[PDB]
Design a protein around this ligand. Structure first.
Ligand SMILES: Oc1ccc(/N=N/c2ccccc2)cc1
Ligand SMILES: Oc1ccc(/N=N/c2ccccc2)cc1
Ligand SMILES: [Fe+3]
Ligand SMILES: [Fe+3]
Lengths: 481, 481
């Protein structure tokens, strides 16, 4: 139809809205022949024009992309996640749900429905594909056909209304370790830590309470504890009644770090306190005894202009997040941090690890780098959320390498793949969508994990440019059993 | 995975190979709200890399695109035509058939199979979609789902092995009027004129003989006769044994024009003779009494670099085709033409008419114009087959108007739609795919048929660039019953 001619739908953020398939993608170079598995990712892509022309980036319907690696070939499939919102709006032929996380602006016909778009994360678990959005239950899809089974409550057991979009895989038990904030509705302090068995059965749902009505986007999991970074990105029902953005960052309130024993309950929860800041995605987290470390980009204010926060608009310099380790001790009194240490001196986000070392001690990480010292010759805005560099950091030595995508391209969230099941940490490949904004083409580029500076060793050249996405994951073919 | 790095697969001729859908295409401007129907077109698009790195453009598997118009909205669907070749090659995962129209280069596993790609024309008839390739029978598909039913012989009646890709619709009887060359196999002089009832039943299959083993791509149909333009674009089994392109244009042999009474047989066929030249697509053809006129672009040699002709590579100046009327008389003795008259002074091809006046006297025509005096700012060659202008000609007065697509875009074969069932000749709309080769985007542009100079009145903006195609047709929704 007629989408708004606003910057949110023009330029590189133009609507895509195409589901389809491609058999045997064009390959420049050679795909690692031993690779055999599935790479899932997802982007927001409103099926119809929004009700309000200022609709946020995070409110678009979820479009899931599957790249199946097998025998040096890559197949492409892309489908809409058939959420309840998507089904009802397709039947209606127009957009019925309102602004981001604002049910006071919804149409009367869909009142009370699950407003999730499942546009934030996609991960293969328990033989199915979990599609996740923070404000809604987990949606279940087929990993290979991308058909939508629908929202789940895990055989009826799960009591929480929501389900996070950043679960971690326990590298010993294979359990899905997730959480949920706003578990009893919007603007509710209820929280839950959740563990799902490798067969999809809910194992534990430990409830507790949160310091604020704040966004809990990501969290950490260690061998013994679950870590929750609480930042004062607040929400107010009063502010929703005033037709303002749902989230809004208070620069006066402090930040908390909640450590919960995985085999405990809310009584065992310990809160630590630190200065005001903005926390991003958790690279990893691990515990040495009672010492708990968590790694994440920290910044003064909004870490991405995709967020529409209350107050002043985007501050491009205060939003620079740097990879930082927070260290608390469960063996100490009080609520004081043991250490905060900046790990990387360039503004970065979307961190990644060798997922085999999740929850455990590690050293190799990959990230997107916002390099402003580089030119950008593409008309159509989008200079601010421009993640144009891919970087690899060795945390054991501080050495780092990087790779620039040129003045035409941007990069999406990378993902690591091991060379062999029992290969050294970070020994393998890093894949990521590189987007040429001049020619409008997307390459699934594959780098050497240890030599990302050497550029890609292979590119799966697509005949279309995939829209700006969020998170994706790799799963070996064996996980489809 | 690895396509040849030749110009035939690089630049604007890159492989597309994406089947998919788009619900409610982005519309710049307004689509005529009364329009309700289907626009089908098709382009070559080899599913896998070829067996020979010099594969021609016409040898790629057929990719069919449907634009459904309804209530001012347009939906997009695109699917592979599942020919026997396509199915067997997908089962094999690689290309099994050899060079263009050369079974001597095929793999042993597909010997005897139908090597058609159904990549030349797609037209709605008898409630189904006929997908056509000159060297193979007609393929039957679903007009709305683009599902493939398969090759047909029309309840077993049709004796011809082949089926042309340029059928004409009788504006009185509703019959599909087609022909066939090589009807008894490759390199056979056997020809057939064919009529299919509006319910799909074979009505006539009148066989005759051809002057040469030559390409019969298009033909004419009048109220009383069928017209066959014979040009010495020859093929030889020797030429296949010598691993040469299937076709090769002899500049020494003459051209013929065969007029056959539609309700007659081979004895009634009359051949007329004229000088050597190259004939293109038939705009229209009609008879006034015994006088028979046919309109088509004529040129010295190869009219498009899509063809690989024997001898020297493409000559862009000898290849300029001009719309020309040939006129013979069935009441005169001998084989002399009554008149040959050039109707349009600019190099043109892909002509189109108000199909309501097919086989009858007419005046309004549309065409693609090769305007070489215009700039073209796209890197990657392809300055030669650049159809950058859309033109409308009034044959009753010789007046003509045109429209340039700019230095970034090219145009594909247009198609006419009447404004209303009872509108004057050429009163309506002209639709065509305009392709931005710098940004790689395709718009289904809609013009006023009488004021194409006023630019498009609407654009269905796609988030992808459709490959260079061949022929398409429009069908009202009523024809889907
Ligand atoms: O529904 C949601 C909710 C939160 C959300 N955060 N994204 C980001 C992206 C980058 C840094 C920090 C947060 C995205 C979608
Ligand atoms: O399979 C085929 C066979 C013939 C063919 N001719 N195209 C043209 C195009 C322009 C002028 C004359 C012929 C196209 C595809
Ligand atoms: Fe995120
Ligand atoms: Fe043609």
């Amino acid at each position: 139809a007629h989408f708004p001619q606003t910057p949110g739908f023009s330029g590189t953020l133009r609507p895509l809205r195409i589901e389809g398939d491609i058999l045997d993608i064009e390959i420049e170079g050679e795909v690692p022949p031993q690779l055999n598995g599935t790479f899932h990712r997802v982007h927001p892509d409103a099926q119809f024009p929004p009700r309000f022309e200022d609709d946020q980036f995070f409110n678009g319907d979820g479009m899931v992309s599957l790249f199946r690696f097998h025998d040096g070939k890559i197949d492409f499939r892309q489908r809409y996640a058939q959420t309840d919102k998507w089904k009802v709006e397709r039947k209606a032929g127009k957009s019925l749900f309102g602004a981001y996380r604002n049910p006071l602006t919804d149409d009367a016909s869909v009142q009370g429905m699950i407003r999730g778009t499942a546009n934030t994360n996609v991960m293969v678990h328990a033989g199915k594909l979990y599609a996740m959005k923070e404000d809604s239950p987990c949606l279940i899809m087929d990993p290979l056909t991308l058909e939508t089974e629908g929202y789940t409550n895990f055989d009826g057991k799960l009591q929480s209304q929501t389900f996070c979009a950043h679960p971690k895989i326990d590298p010993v038990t294979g359990n899905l370790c997730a959480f949920a904030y706003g578990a009893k509705g919007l603007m509710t302090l209820d929280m839950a830590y959740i563990e799902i068995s490798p067969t999809g059965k809910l194992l534990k749902e430990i409830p507790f309470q949160n310091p604020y009505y704040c966004m809990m986007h990501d969290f950490g999991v260690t061998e013994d504890y679950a870590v929750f970074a609480v930042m004062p990105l607040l929400s107010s029902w009063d502010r929703l009644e005033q037709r303002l953005p749902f989230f809004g960052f208070d620069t006066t309130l402090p930040c908390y770090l909640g450590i919960l024993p995985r085999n405990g309950d809310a009584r065992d929860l310990r809160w630590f306190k630190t200065g005001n800041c903005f926390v991003g995605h958790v690279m990893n987290a691990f515990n040495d005894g009672t010492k708990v470390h968590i790694d994440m980009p920290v910044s003064r204010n909004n870490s991405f202009p995709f967020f529409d926060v209350h107050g002043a608009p985007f501050d491009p310099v205060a939003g620079q997040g740097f990879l930082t380790r927070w260290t608390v001790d469960m063996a100490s009194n009080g609520d004081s941090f043991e250490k905060t240490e900046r790990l990387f001196d360039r503004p970065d986000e979307f961190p990644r690890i060798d997922e085999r070392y999740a929850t455990r001690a590690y050293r190799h990480g990959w990230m997107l780098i916002l390099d402003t010292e580089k030119p950008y010759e593409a008309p159509g805005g989008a200079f601010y959320a421009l993640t144009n560099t891919l970087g690899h950091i060795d945390l054991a030595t501080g050495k780092s390498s990087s790779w620039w995508a040129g003045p035409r391209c941007a990069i999406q969230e990378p993902c690591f793949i091991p060379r062999s099941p029992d290969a050294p940490e970070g020994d393998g490949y890093v894949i990521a969508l590189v987007d040429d904004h001049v020619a409008n083409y997307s390459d699934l580029a594959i780098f050497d994990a240890q030599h990302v500076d050497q550029g890609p060793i292979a590119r799966a050249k697509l005949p279309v440019r995939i829209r700006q996405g969020l998170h994706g994951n790799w799963a070996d073919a064996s996980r489809l059993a």
